[PDB]
């Protein structure tokens, strides 16, 4: 059955890629009316959440800002925002985390299709969800709050690649927003562990291994380019890079704050700016690996959840385990 929802609910034939496929999807007449209406409903919800965020941020005296949370999958981005961006943490509590620009915001809703249960896989709904995230981000560009001020917005994508970074900088410049960027790094194995801990009944995506590994390579390789942008332009906004110590705790590694560049942890800075190409896909999850990962987790709850996630795939390679874990609905 594995055609994507864009095929199932699109009317007529699907043009194949930009700018063919793209514009076909933008025209509502190209969808069954039920899907069209579902699109309208999800965008309304997402836009209301974003406005709530933007109003909280303005009331707390924040000038128009693009908050960008850069970093690979499952690196600990949600916790960094809660702890290290107090004004955003206050906004997010009011929406229970909703309202951010993220190509995965619409996936669960689209996968359930208002039927009360998930019937499409993440991969089946991805293109449709990304199409929606694009419409959502498009309308936020010139979104105003109740004071007529430009609305602050939150983008939490991987933001690995140079062209992605450039586009959000250009968006911010064009729309009069500061860029407030936190860049969050974890070892690849941490992301793999983090992904295996995400339960199918939860909303967080469960990507297979190559997504996580290629995401890790890209985020590391293109990190210094991002830092260069803030060093070069003090008026861009502020940058903070957080890396993960041996014990799992996040620590600040480098920062550009007030146009001032500092390296809080030069050892980590050298490490987390390169992909360290030595591979992990074939490494087998066995007792030793699990014991090794437990050895560096002190929190009882996390240690227990980490263990359970891994034990489920005991004897499997990282690749096979994330594959199996990804295929669950």
């Amino acid at each position: 059955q594995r055609k994507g929802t864009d095929e199932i609910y699109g009317l007529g034939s699907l043009p194949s890629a930009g700018p063919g496929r793209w514009e076909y999807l933008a025209n509502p007449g190209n969808w069954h009316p039920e899907r069209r209406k579902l699109h309208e409903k999800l965008l309304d919800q997402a836009r209301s959440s974003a406005l709530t965020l933007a109003e909280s941020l303005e009331s707390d005296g924040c000038q128009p800002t693009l908050f960008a949370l850069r970093g690979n999958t499952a690196t600990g981005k949600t916790r960094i925002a809660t702890k290290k961006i107090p004004v955003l943490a206050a906004a997010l509590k009011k929406t229970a985390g909703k309202g951010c620009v993220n190509p995965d915001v619409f996936k669960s809703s689209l996968a359930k299709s208002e039927t009360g249960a998930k019937i499409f896989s993440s991969a089946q709904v991805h293109s449709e969800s990304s199409f929606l995230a694009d419409r959502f981000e498009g309308g936020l560009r010139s979104q105003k709050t109740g004071s007529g001020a430009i609305a602050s917005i939150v983008v939490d994508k991987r933001l690995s690649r140079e062209y992605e970074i450039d586009s959000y900088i250009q968006l911010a410049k064009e729309t009069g927003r500061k860029v407030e960027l936190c860049d969050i790094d974890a070892p690849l194995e941490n992301s793999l562990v983090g992904v295996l801990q995400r339960k199918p009944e939860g909303e967080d995506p469960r990507p297979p291994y190559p997504v996580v590994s290629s995401g890790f390579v890209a985020v590391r390789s293109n990190r210094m380019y991002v830092i260069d942008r803030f060093i070069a332009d003090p008026s861009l906004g502020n940058y903070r890079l957080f890396g993960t110590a041996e014990d799992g705790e996040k620590v600040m590694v480098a920062s550009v704050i007030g146009g001032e560049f500092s390296v809080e942890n030069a050892e980590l800075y050298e490490k987390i700016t390169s992909p360290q190409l030595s591979d992990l896909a074939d490494k087998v999850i066995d007792k030793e690996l699990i014991d090794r990962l437990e050895n560096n987790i002190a929190d009882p709850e996390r240690a227990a959840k980490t263990r359970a996630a891994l034990e489920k795939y005991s004897g499997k390679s990282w690749s096979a385990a994330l594959a199996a874990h990804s295929e669950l609905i």
């Binding site: 990304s130 210094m224 800075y269």
Partner: protein
């Protein structure tokens, strides 16, 4: 440890950029030598683009970035993938996710 500041921070950053740029270029050069030795199919963007979209649905337009991304991933990240067809599979997977 002590935070690097001012001139020292900037100089550490400059030298680290040089190191990583040298490693970046080296990883690909070595991968190419190895690829030729094992008969891995030569990377061809145009032919790859004739089984998948390398633009991120129109996001990536700079062809010199499009080439660098996929050529380098093909050789450096997937040295054991031997053919463009097989790599096709991978890129498809990557764009099925975020």
């Amino acid at each position: 440890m002590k935070t690097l500041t001012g001139a020292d921070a900037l100089e550490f950053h400059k030298k680290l950029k040089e190191r990583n740029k040298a490693l970046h270029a080296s990883d690909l050069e070595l991968a190419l030598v190895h690829a030729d030795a094992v008969g891995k199919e030569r990377f061809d963007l145009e032919e790859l683009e004739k089984i998948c979209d390398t633009s991120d649905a129109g996001r990536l337009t700079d062809a010199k970035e499009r080439n660098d991304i996929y050529e380098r991933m093909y050789y450096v990240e997937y040295p054991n993938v031997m053919t463009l067809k097989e790599f096709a599979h991978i890129v498809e997977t990557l764009f099925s996710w975020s």
